[PDB]
Amino acid sequence: FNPLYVMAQSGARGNPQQIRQLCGMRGLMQKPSGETFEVPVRSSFREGLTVLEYFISSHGARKGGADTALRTADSGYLTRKLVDVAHEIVVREADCGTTNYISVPLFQMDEVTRTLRLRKRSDIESGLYGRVLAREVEALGRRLEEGRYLSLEDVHFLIKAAEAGEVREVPVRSPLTCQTRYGVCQKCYGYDLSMARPVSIGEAVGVVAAESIGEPGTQLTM
Amino acid sequence: RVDYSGRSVIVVGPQLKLHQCGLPKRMALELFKPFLLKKMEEKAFAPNVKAARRMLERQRDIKDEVWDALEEVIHGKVVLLNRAPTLHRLGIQAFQPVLVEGQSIQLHPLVCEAFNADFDGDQMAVHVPLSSFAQAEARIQMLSAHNLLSPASGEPLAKPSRDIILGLYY
Amino acid sequence: PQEKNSLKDLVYQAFLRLGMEKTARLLDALKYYGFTLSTTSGITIGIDDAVIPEEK
Amino acid sequence: KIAQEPVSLETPIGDEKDSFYGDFIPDENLPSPVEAAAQSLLSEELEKALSKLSEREAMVLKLRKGLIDGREHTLEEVGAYFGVTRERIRQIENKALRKLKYHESRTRKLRDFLE
Amino acid sequence: YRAQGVKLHDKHIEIVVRQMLKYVEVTDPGDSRLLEGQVLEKWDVEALNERLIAEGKVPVAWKPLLMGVTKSALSTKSWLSAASFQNTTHVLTEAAIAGKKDELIGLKENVILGRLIPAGTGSDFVRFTQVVDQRTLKAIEEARKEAVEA
Amino acid sequence: EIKRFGRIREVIPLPPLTEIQVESYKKALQADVPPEKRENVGIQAAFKETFPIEEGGLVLDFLEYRIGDPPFSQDECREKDLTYQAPLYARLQLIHKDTGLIKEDEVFLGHLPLMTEDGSFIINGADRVIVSQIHRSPGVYFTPDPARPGRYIASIIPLPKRGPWIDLEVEASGVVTMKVNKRKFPLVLLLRVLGYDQETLVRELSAYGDLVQGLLDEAVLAMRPEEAMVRLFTLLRPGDPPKKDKALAYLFGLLADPKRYDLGEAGRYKAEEKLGVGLSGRTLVRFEDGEFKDEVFLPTLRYLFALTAGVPGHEVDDIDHLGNRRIRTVGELMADQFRVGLARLARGVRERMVMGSPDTLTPAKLVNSRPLEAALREFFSRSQLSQFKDETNPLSSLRHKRRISALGPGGLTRERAGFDVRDVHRTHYGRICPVETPEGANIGLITSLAAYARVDALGFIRTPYRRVKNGVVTEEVVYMTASEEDRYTIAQANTPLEGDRIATDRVVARRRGEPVIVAPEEVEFMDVSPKQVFSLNTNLIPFLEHDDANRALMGSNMQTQAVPLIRAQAPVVMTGLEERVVRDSLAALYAEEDGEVVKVDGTRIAVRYEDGRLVEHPLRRYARSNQGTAFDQRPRVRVGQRVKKGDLLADGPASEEGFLALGQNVLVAIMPFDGYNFEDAIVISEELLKRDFYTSIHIERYEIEARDTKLGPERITRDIPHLSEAALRDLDEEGIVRIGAEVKPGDILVGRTSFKGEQEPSPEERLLRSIFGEKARDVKDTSLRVPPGEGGIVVGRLRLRRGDPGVELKPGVREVVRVFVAQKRKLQVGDKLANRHGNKGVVAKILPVEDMPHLPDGTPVDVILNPLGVPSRMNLGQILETHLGLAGYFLGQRYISPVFDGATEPEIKELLAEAFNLYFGKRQGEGFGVDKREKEVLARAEKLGLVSPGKSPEEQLKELFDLGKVVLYDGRTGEPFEGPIVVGQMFIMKLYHMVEDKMHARSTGPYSLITQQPLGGKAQFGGQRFGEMEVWALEAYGAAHTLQEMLTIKSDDIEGRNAAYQAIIKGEDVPEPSVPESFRVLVKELQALALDVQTLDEKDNPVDIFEGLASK
Amino acid sequence: KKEVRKVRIALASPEKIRSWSYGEVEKPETINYRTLKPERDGLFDERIFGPIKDYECACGKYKRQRFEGKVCERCGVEVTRSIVRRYRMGHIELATPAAHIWFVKDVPSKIG
Amino acid sequence: AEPGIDKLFGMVDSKYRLTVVVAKRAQQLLRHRFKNTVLEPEERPKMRTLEGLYDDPNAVTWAMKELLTGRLFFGENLVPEDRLQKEMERLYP
Ligand SMILES: [Mg+2]
Ligand SMILES: [Zn+2]
Ligand SMILES: [Zn+2]
């Protein structure tokens, strides 16, 4: 029932490393050259840090800060670029009339780790959710229809079937294969992720895409 | 840069609902001024538009009449709230004028995560759509209450946060 | 016990099944209740609330 | 005072790279929406406050004001157009003025625009 | 993105990528007016080849040309788009030299123009939608039968 | 009662904190120093380097220079809006070589600004400060090639404007090339006139083998000095024909010239002690007997080629090392620009000689003021290093003065700064504060000087270290530079001492910033105090050891933004540096000698000193600052008590009894409250507004200018044509507002009438004019009316009219009228509050005293901060401040807890135990037991195990109390909070940002002339900028008409916004716009580029957006 | 009157430039040092670019909306809105022809 | 908020169609001063005011409830535009 642990577990506030710095050792530090220091900082914040520890940790710290700032700049950069390239992409036709598609694999392969492994659920959702089935799918004694919009439940079912090993590939209509002129069309695109239903015509998905990729642009350090 | 616009530092909205924000009184008076001129034209007190405008400009005589009239033009209409930097489309969301004392704009706690807003002195902007067409666009597809799931992810954006999680977990 | 992921799947399931308005209501309800209960809990942070393992 | 030079409109303001000197200059040459609306309401309200007069005196007034061709028709000109003497025109306009004094003393619609 | 812990759907990235490789380099122009190595859009050469097959002529062979998002957007049909982006001088020069006509298909050129944006409610699909009520509908419903009698 | 903690006792006091600016500008002036005995450095260095000049057969010369007395004092210059400056008179003797004519004659120079006692100047009636600059020290250095991984490139370099950069780089042919001013040429070709040939370059030169042959070119070695002089003059300066004398003069001015090329004295010394050689002057080469002789190039090529061989003793220099970096202080900069202007003046003199009458000319006719005047004017007004002083509080100006910037002219800029100059080097330790720095694109660039850090004559920052001999510490404190520190091994200030000598066998030490555990036998030095490792603001954070670096940074930066309060109080727990902060800030009045107070009142504190003299100290009361924060001095002394020397008389805005008072001490409860504290928002008890806590005074000043326009003269008068009686009330005589009058937004501060441009009234207009019969009169009303959102009371009154003494007003302008307006600002919803630990916040709704989480004695808390802000930002210092604040509130004493020598957990716990004994003891002394609700909370705390089971409620409440947590009752219910909640005294700060200033909205205002866009900012009554990203947002939504209104009607479209405002006024729906009107500007601009812009139609036909306008 | 669905950009011939031109600016002044009126042939000249005041000519002979489009006989100022000074373009006839620096300096130089 | 928004979404394929519909309907209502309404006195969206409970002046809301009823017909090329507006003014002064 401790406040720190509770805020951590519930997802209210704080991460294991912050709690690590607030309870256990603050860890090992990195000198400006980039090679890690030979001696640790021992005591946590609540124990208090000696002058030296604080100094080295300040090297690392300000390094981090400069990183974040330059990174917001570059985020604005990339965002504007993407917006400029994808702006013309808009839902126009309900059906562009193409038989072309892409097959999304449910299994990746860790190299030198040999055996094919089932892709983590979030990735599979990231490629399958909202998608329209290119062609018929047969798994687990049930069938999935042509031109069906896959819901979350449908994706989880396809995962269950992938574990069941009847499907290693998911045929799906994609913007990539879409024949729509100066943009993409409905079924080739998918659900409108905000409303969890088939995308409304006239939706400009290029700008939406550009922003969608753009916002995360400020969170990449590690 | 645009006419019919403003900005202020932000304050949490705990009593307020999702489709609402706390748009302050003075800011609203200046923002909606033409509408207020017409509503003062219809509702007695001054003969015409000019009398209303001259009334409002000199001598801040503001009286319950003009405030209730302000809430007469306000009702049902929504305004757009903006937080810089604008990354998502969710960086701009529709909310309602609610006349409140104090110079700070009140914002809903759930949509903060969408604007990437904390109150350290962060500031937000207010724009008012004029035409009934634009108003329709604002209340229908641009409304905060109507936008929940993240268009980027497909997982719901407007979300319980901090204290809320703490209590439900609790 | 309810937490971020659980509450999230709750909200999404509610959106997918019930509807938009019902979910807005649900959200604000969880807001009011969550806040009031957070107040009632009296959850606070002292210096000894960051307890050290004796093994350190 | 003559010797001094003009200032470059592009002269930087503050340490900011986003601002010039010239774009801080307002336009007084161009009527503001409030001003156009003000002139509109003035012309309209004056038009309605004019209509309660006799036809002739109103016509005379708007001949004097420039409400017709924009120019200013004196005395004799008005007398020449309506076929009467100029003095009569004078008395006519004075009378008009005072009648407007009454009705405006009532409605208070035109009591503004007094700046 | 997944390494960082940020989850986003593949659709967006796919759209951007399709915009990246959208260009083609011409090899053996065949019977067309094209020249070797001339760069143009996918759908354009596709259509041209369709018509050429229908016309009983030799189609145009080509190769997939993928470029960075910057140059991809820089090579776009709309000159206002490329002008507003960056490298304004080069664009404008090539543009005016060729005397290219912007058809205002994209949204941001219309944004420059201050014209109703081709997307959203301004989409040509939903913007011509008409709205009537029963009584007015019946009035104008009589309007059609009184025209033939006059 | 005030309690001190920690065992570390600083043997040396903090040196004067304003000393960098004051002393540096002192050395560059030498005012009291006689013109005879002066130091030849700074301004006199400029004089001696610009003189004598000879070029008929005139010979000038200098003699002395004289500082004038200021024509106006500080205050006068400030309220006249004139730079504070004094005339500088150079005494300069003119001679004739051939004639023998001596006309000595004094002369003028210009006006030189004087630095005040605080260390800031005044330019144009505005207090400004010149920040210290950081660049790399002069000398020569060696770094590995960016292009070639296998070798080391060489670099030679002097002071800026003192001559060009030099690079010795081996190109990969095997041949060598030199680069100065962007160009290429072999070294031998330069060895040239320096008296070297094939043999002299192969003689010693090879310990090498392979490295000798890449140097030699026989074609160049064949030709001898003046020929290859012509050659290098042909290469390096292609513009003029390759003359021999031109080559001689030019390349003499490039290198051998002591004036034109000045290599730093520090660079002279360092380069002399690096290459293993010695140097006569500061010049790269010497011009002697008509031939050039080598100084620099030979030993630096020696060291270059040696290091590249791999021979021991030679190594690559560290670029970011502070031993290779120096500080430009204010005096050196001022003298630099001074000598530039002096050079321009030299050229003026040189132009004026060759005309007129070369026989008789006084130096008065030969010399002009403007070159130096405009040079200094340009440096003080324009230059980036010169910026607006921070007057928000005393500590603001103090830190602003101690600030070190890498930016500015001669330095670096935002773009070329990577992780190189932004990072923290090993040697930043006792010199540059590792934490304090802006949280912006400027991180790592602009930093602050450390507390004990000092800048010597050579510009090298040095820091105090106590020498220790065989475990025994010496009272001798040595100031050591970066390299000097690098040589020795230094212990730590917290190392255990047993009465002046070392105790432990394992001592914490360092060799060149590398932590090492080592014995007392080999330690030659020790830190004076941990305080020297941080800046001033950082040193004001108690328990800094428990706070993360980021939030510490934020803490200091926010301490800078501090606004003074009326009741403002010094923190309960302090680090002890606050006193010296208020002292060296010079915002407080002290006793200069021993004496007695003979009077007080709020104007003059008079003291009769022991020396017999009666000296009164005038008190500044409510003086407007730069940011508007009031500067006030409240005397604390009784009449008739004898003061010591240096003793306090009157406080400052930010001072309490000689202690720094930034914010106030309030009672904080850490807990969630109804989601009002959500996201670091701050609930506040309304009680603060009752006690006038966090109430600040802000004076804003407005000015107005009566001119003579060609139309007619402007005039300040009470008479205004259409003005009603009631609006003219406080205007008493000349049309100026009286003193002590409340001014509402829209009210007239001062009246003014300017003749309108003569034009007709419109037909309708003149119809109106006739109807009311009110004479259309002449002049129109220009009067100054206080801007919206602003208002207050009138204190100050100033009128400067021309034709009157003491004031010279610019041409065309009759009189300027200026009014001080002071405002009383209580804490409002939306205002900003923060602590010393870097916890930001906005005021989110205030709460009535009725419902508050209170104590069993009925004492309500003053804030209710949110705990959720704590674990992410990782600042635990505020927690400790809250605990000690609780103990301090109860036992009624304050604390001093220095940085890194602090109070500890057991100490604080003990104080909590004592305070609890007093508190609960007083509870039972008043005849009360333990409340039932408390038994409930104690029970549920026992189940979760916050208290030991089996112990009585007294002992459990005791165990809970020292934890900082007490029982709290909800003022709304009366029921206790389920869990215990930490409460106590926290030091919290009202900052600069307020809703009062930052709330603005606009409907229809002024528009720009070029394009019809509305103006920016609040001051201009501007509209909000809608960015491209926001356009992308609207497009993403798919709102077409919203985006349309944004792009047309509501922004710049003339007919659109007009017809729209018309429609809303008449109650319609706004029409569809047409032309954005900025787009038409775009079209015609494109046409100005001779590009035909055709706007076509559905069928490829011209559509003219200019309607009957440009058609022709 | 008609919709604008298309915008093109091309090279403006000298003839087109002269067609746009309401006159040549001969004299390199701006305004008189005192009267602050546009100089005779100067850059700000009303005789070509149009009047500073709506419908009011320079001399002040034709004063009203009544007269429209008629050139005044002294100043040569067209009676019309004062807004035309934003649109109407002038020109400078060059003695010896010169090149537009764009088609020269552009990365793939066009004339080159 | 705007109740029935889910059903409103269900009424049309693309949302922007709905937005266009509500916009134009609110336009008609503002034009004719709420006399072209298909609503009934009980269904009229009443704004609460101390002076009295009046008709909500907001046309958007009116259009929302109006389309929520279903008495409204919408579509492309439904009726000639000219005759539409013509008799639209013919019915209501
Ligand atoms: Mg913030
Ligand atoms: Zn498709
Ligand atoms: Zn004329």
PDB file of N, CA, C and O in Angstrom, chain B residues 71-106:
ATOM      1  N   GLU B  71     -24.853  35.042 -22.394  1.00  0.00           N
ATOM      2  CA  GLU B  71     -25.171  33.623 -22.274  1.00  0.00           C
ATOM      3  C   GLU B  71     -26.345  33.227 -23.166  1.00  0.00           C
ATOM      4  O   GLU B  71     -26.615  32.042 -23.359  1.00  0.00           O
ATOM      5  N   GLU B  72     -27.043  34.221 -23.709  1.00  0.00           N
ATOM      6  CA  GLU B  72     -28.080  33.955 -24.699  1.00  0.00           C
ATOM      7  C   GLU B  72     -27.461  33.652 -26.061  1.00  0.00           C
ATOM      8  O   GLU B  72     -27.870  32.708 -26.734  1.00  0.00           O
ATOM      9  N   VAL B  73     -26.475  34.447 -26.467  1.00  0.00           N
ATOM     10  CA  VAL B  73     -25.778  34.167 -27.723  1.00  0.00           C
ATOM     11  C   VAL B  73     -24.834  32.970 -27.604  1.00  0.00           C
ATOM     12  O   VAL B  73     -24.581  32.268 -28.583  1.00  0.00           O
ATOM     13  N   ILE B  74     -24.323  32.744 -26.399  1.00  0.00           N
ATOM     14  CA  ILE B  74     -23.373  31.664 -26.149  1.00  0.00           C
ATOM     15  C   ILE B  74     -23.991  30.272 -26.300  1.00  0.00           C
ATOM     16  O   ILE B  74     -23.371  29.371 -26.870  1.00  0.00           O
ATOM     17  N   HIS B  75     -25.219  30.116 -25.814  1.00  0.00           N
ATOM     18  CA  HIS B  75     -25.828  28.798 -25.630  1.00  0.00           C
ATOM     19  C   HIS B  75     -25.845  27.919 -26.878  1.00  0.00           C
ATOM     20  O   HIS B  75     -26.313  28.326 -27.942  1.00  0.00           O
ATOM     21  N   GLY B  76     -25.317  26.709 -26.726  1.00  0.00           N
ATOM     22  CA  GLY B  76     -25.344  25.707 -27.774  1.00  0.00           C
ATOM     23  C   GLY B  76     -24.152  25.801 -28.704  1.00  0.00           C
ATOM     24  O   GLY B  76     -23.766  24.816 -29.331  1.00  0.00           O
ATOM     25  N   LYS B  77     -23.560  26.988 -28.782  1.00  0.00           N
ATOM     26  CA  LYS B  77     -22.391  27.202 -29.628  1.00  0.00           C
ATOM     27  C   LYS B  77     -21.095  26.807 -28.928  1.00  0.00           C
ATOM     28  O   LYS B  77     -20.976  26.921 -27.708  1.00  0.00           O
ATOM     29  N   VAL B  78     -20.132  26.330 -29.710  1.00  0.00           N
ATOM     30  CA  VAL B  78     -18.857  25.882 -29.165  1.00  0.00           C
ATOM     31  C   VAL B  78     -17.679  26.678 -29.724  1.00  0.00           C
ATOM     32  O   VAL B  78     -17.771  27.279 -30.794  1.00  0.00           O
ATOM     33  N   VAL B  79     -16.575  26.678 -28.984  1.00  0.00           N
ATOM     34  CA  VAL B  79     -15.346  27.328 -29.417  1.00  0.00           C
ATOM     35  C   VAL B  79     -14.196  26.326 -29.468  1.00  0.00           C
ATOM     36  O   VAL B  79     -14.209  25.313 -28.768  1.00  0.00           O
ATOM     37  N   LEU B  80     -13.207  26.615 -30.305  1.00  0.00           N
ATOM     38  CA  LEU B  80     -12.046  25.752 -30.470  1.00  0.00           C
ATOM     39  C   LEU B  80     -10.918  26.132 -29.517  1.00  0.00           C
ATOM     40  O   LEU B  80     -10.564  27.307 -29.388  1.00  0.00           O
ATOM     41  N   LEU B  81     -10.361  25.121 -28.859  1.00  0.00           N
ATOM     42  CA  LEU B  81      -9.230  25.299 -27.961  1.00  0.00           C
ATOM     43  C   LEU B  81      -7.963  24.717 -28.577  1.00  0.00           C
ATOM     44  O   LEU B  81      -7.976  23.616 -29.138  1.00  0.00           O
ATOM     45  N   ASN B  82      -6.873  25.468 -28.442  1.00  0.00           N
ATOM     46  CA  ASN B  82      -5.617  25.202 -29.128  1.00  0.00           C
ATOM     47  C   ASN B  82      -4.465  25.157 -28.134  1.00  0.00           C
ATOM     48  O   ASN B  82      -4.347  26.031 -27.281  1.00  0.00           O
ATOM     49  N   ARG B  83      -3.610  24.145 -28.248  1.00  0.00           N
ATOM     50  CA  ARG B  83      -2.399  24.087 -27.440  1.00  0.00           C
ATOM     51  C   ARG B  83      -1.157  23.891 -28.304  1.00  0.00           C
ATOM     52  O   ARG B  83      -1.047  22.912 -29.041  1.00  0.00           O
ATOM     53  N   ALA B  84      -0.228  24.837 -28.209  1.00  0.00           N
ATOM     54  CA  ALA B  84       1.041  24.744 -28.922  1.00  0.00           C
ATOM     55  C   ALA B  84       2.067  23.984 -28.084  1.00  0.00           C
ATOM     56  O   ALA B  84       2.116  24.152 -26.866  1.00  0.00           O
ATOM     57  N   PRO B  85       2.894  23.144 -28.731  1.00  0.00           N
ATOM     58  CA  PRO B  85       2.922  22.873 -30.172  1.00  0.00           C
ATOM     59  C   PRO B  85       1.762  21.987 -30.606  1.00  0.00           C
ATOM     60  O   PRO B  85       1.338  21.114 -29.850  1.00  0.00           O
ATOM     61  N   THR B  86       1.264  22.203 -31.818  1.00  0.00           N
ATOM     62  CA  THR B  86       0.175  21.389 -32.331  1.00  0.00           C
ATOM     63  C   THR B  86       0.747  20.221 -33.120  1.00  0.00           C
ATOM     64  O   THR B  86       1.317  20.400 -34.194  1.00  0.00           O
ATOM     65  N   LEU B  87       0.585  19.023 -32.573  1.00  0.00           N
ATOM     66  CA  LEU B  87       1.151  17.823 -33.168  1.00  0.00           C
ATOM     67  C   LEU B  87       0.041  16.980 -33.775  1.00  0.00           C
ATOM     68  O   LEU B  87      -0.012  16.785 -34.989  1.00  0.00           O
ATOM     69  N   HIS B  88      -0.846  16.484 -32.917  1.00  0.00           N
ATOM     70  CA  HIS B  88      -2.035  15.770 -33.363  1.00  0.00           C
ATOM     71  C   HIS B  88      -3.026  16.759 -33.950  1.00  0.00           C
ATOM     72  O   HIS B  88      -2.784  17.966 -33.952  1.00  0.00           O
ATOM     73  N   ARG B  89      -4.150  16.248 -34.439  1.00  0.00           N
ATOM     74  CA  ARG B  89      -5.283  17.111 -34.724  1.00  0.00           C
ATOM     75  C   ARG B  89      -5.955  17.376 -33.387  1.00  0.00           C
ATOM     76  O   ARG B  89      -6.628  18.386 -33.198  1.00  0.00           O
ATOM     77  N   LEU B  90      -5.711  16.475 -32.441  1.00  0.00           N
ATOM     78  CA  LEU B  90      -6.265  16.582 -31.098  1.00  0.00           C
ATOM     79  C   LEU B  90      -5.635  17.739 -30.328  1.00  0.00           C
ATOM     80  O   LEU B  90      -6.043  18.045 -29.208  1.00  0.00           O
ATOM     81  N   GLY B  91      -4.637  18.376 -30.933  1.00  0.00           N
ATOM     82  CA  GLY B  91      -4.076  19.604 -30.400  1.00  0.00           C
ATOM     83  C   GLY B  91      -5.062  20.755 -30.501  1.00  0.00           C
ATOM     84  O   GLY B  91      -4.821  21.842 -29.978  1.00  0.00           O
ATOM     85  N   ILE B  92      -6.173  20.514 -31.193  1.00  0.00           N
ATOM     86  CA  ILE B  92      -7.275  21.466 -31.267  1.00  0.00           C
ATOM     87  C   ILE B  92      -8.600  20.743 -31.051  1.00  0.00           C
ATOM     88  O   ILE B  92      -8.930  19.820 -31.793  1.00  0.00           O
ATOM     89  N   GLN B  93      -9.356  21.151 -30.034  1.00  0.00           N
ATOM     90  CA  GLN B  93     -10.625  20.479 -29.732  1.00  0.00           C
ATOM     91  C   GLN B  93     -11.748  21.449 -29.373  1.00  0.00           C
ATOM     92  O   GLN B  93     -11.505  22.492 -28.775  1.00  0.00           O
ATOM     93  N   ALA B  94     -12.979  21.093 -29.729  1.00  0.00           N
ATOM     94  CA  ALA B  94     -14.126  21.953 -29.452  1.00  0.00           C
ATOM     95  C   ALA B  94     -14.659  21.768 -28.035  1.00  0.00           C
ATOM     96  O   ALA B  94     -14.749  20.649 -27.528  1.00  0.00           O
ATOM     97  N   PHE B  95     -15.009  22.884 -27.408  1.00  0.00           N
ATOM     98  CA  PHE B  95     -15.543  22.902 -26.054  1.00  0.00           C
ATOM     99  C   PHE B  95     -16.585  24.010 -25.992  1.00  0.00           C
ATOM    100  O   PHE B  95     -16.881  24.619 -27.002  1.00  0.00           O
ATOM    101  N   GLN B  96     -17.130  24.298 -24.816  1.00  0.00           N
ATOM    102  CA  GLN B  96     -18.189  25.299 -24.730  1.00  0.00           C
ATOM    103  C   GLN B  96     -17.775  26.532 -23.948  1.00  0.00           C
ATOM    104  O   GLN B  96     -16.933  26.449 -23.067  1.00  0.00           O
ATOM    105  N   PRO B  97     -18.348  27.693 -24.288  1.00  0.00           N
ATOM    106  CA  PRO B  97     -18.189  28.814 -23.361  1.00  0.00           C
ATOM    107  C   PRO B  97     -18.985  28.561 -22.086  1.00  0.00           C
ATOM    108  O   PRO B  97     -20.176  28.252 -22.151  1.00  0.00           O
ATOM    109  N   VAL B  98     -18.331  28.695 -20.939  1.00  0.00           N
ATOM    110  CA  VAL B  98     -19.025  28.701 -19.660  1.00  0.00           C
ATOM    111  C   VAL B  98     -18.507  29.895 -18.882  1.00  0.00           C
ATOM    112  O   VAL B  98     -17.351  29.906 -18.459  1.00  0.00           O
ATOM    113  N   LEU B  99     -19.361  30.888 -18.664  1.00  0.00           N
ATOM    114  CA  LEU B  99     -18.895  32.134 -18.074  1.00  0.00           C
ATOM    115  C   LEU B  99     -18.498  31.917 -16.623  1.00  0.00           C
ATOM    116  O   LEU B  99     -19.302  31.477 -15.801  1.00  0.00           O
ATOM    117  N   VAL B 100     -17.246  32.236 -16.318  1.00  0.00           N
ATOM    118  CA  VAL B 100     -16.690  31.972 -15.000  1.00  0.00           C
ATOM    119  C   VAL B 100     -15.800  33.130 -14.559  1.00  0.00           C
ATOM    120  O   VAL B 100     -15.110  33.746 -15.375  1.00  0.00           O
ATOM    121  N   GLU B 101     -15.839  33.436 -13.267  1.00  0.00           N
ATOM    122  CA  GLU B 101     -15.046  34.525 -12.718  1.00  0.00           C
ATOM    123  C   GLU B 101     -13.579  34.117 -12.639  1.00  0.00           C
ATOM    124  O   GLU B 101     -13.258  32.961 -12.365  1.00  0.00           O
ATOM    125  N   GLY B 102     -12.695  35.078 -12.881  1.00  0.00           N
ATOM    126  CA  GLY B 102     -11.278  34.796 -12.990  1.00  0.00           C
ATOM    127  C   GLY B 102     -10.847  34.905 -14.439  1.00  0.00           C
ATOM    128  O   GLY B 102     -11.664  34.772 -15.349  1.00  0.00           O
ATOM    129  N   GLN B 103      -9.562  35.153 -14.656  1.00  0.00           N
ATOM    130  CA  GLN B 103      -9.049  35.405 -15.998  1.00  0.00           C
ATOM    131  C   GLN B 103      -8.461  34.164 -16.672  1.00  0.00           C
ATOM    132  O   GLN B 103      -7.947  34.240 -17.785  1.00  0.00           O
ATOM    133  N   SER B 104      -8.544  33.023 -15.998  1.00  0.00           N
ATOM    134  CA  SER B 104      -7.949  31.794 -16.513  1.00  0.00           C
ATOM    135  C   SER B 104      -8.962  30.872 -17.196  1.00  0.00           C
ATOM    136  O   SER B 104     -10.110  30.760 -16.763  1.00  0.00           O
ATOM    137  N   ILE B 105      -8.523  30.218 -18.267  1.00  0.00           N
ATOM    138  CA  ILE B 105      -9.358  29.279 -19.011  1.00  0.00           C
ATOM    139  C   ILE B 105      -9.353  27.910 -18.344  1.00  0.00           C
ATOM    140  O   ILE B 105      -8.292  27.356 -18.070  1.00  0.00           O
ATOM    141  N   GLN B 106     -10.536  27.360 -18.096  1.00  0.00           N
ATOM    142  CA  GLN B 106     -10.637  26.056 -17.450  1.00  0.00           C
ATOM    143  C   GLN B 106     -10.756  24.922 -18.466  1.00  0.00           C
ATOM    144  O   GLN B 106     -11.613  24.949 -19.348  1.00  0.00           O
TER     145      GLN B 106
END
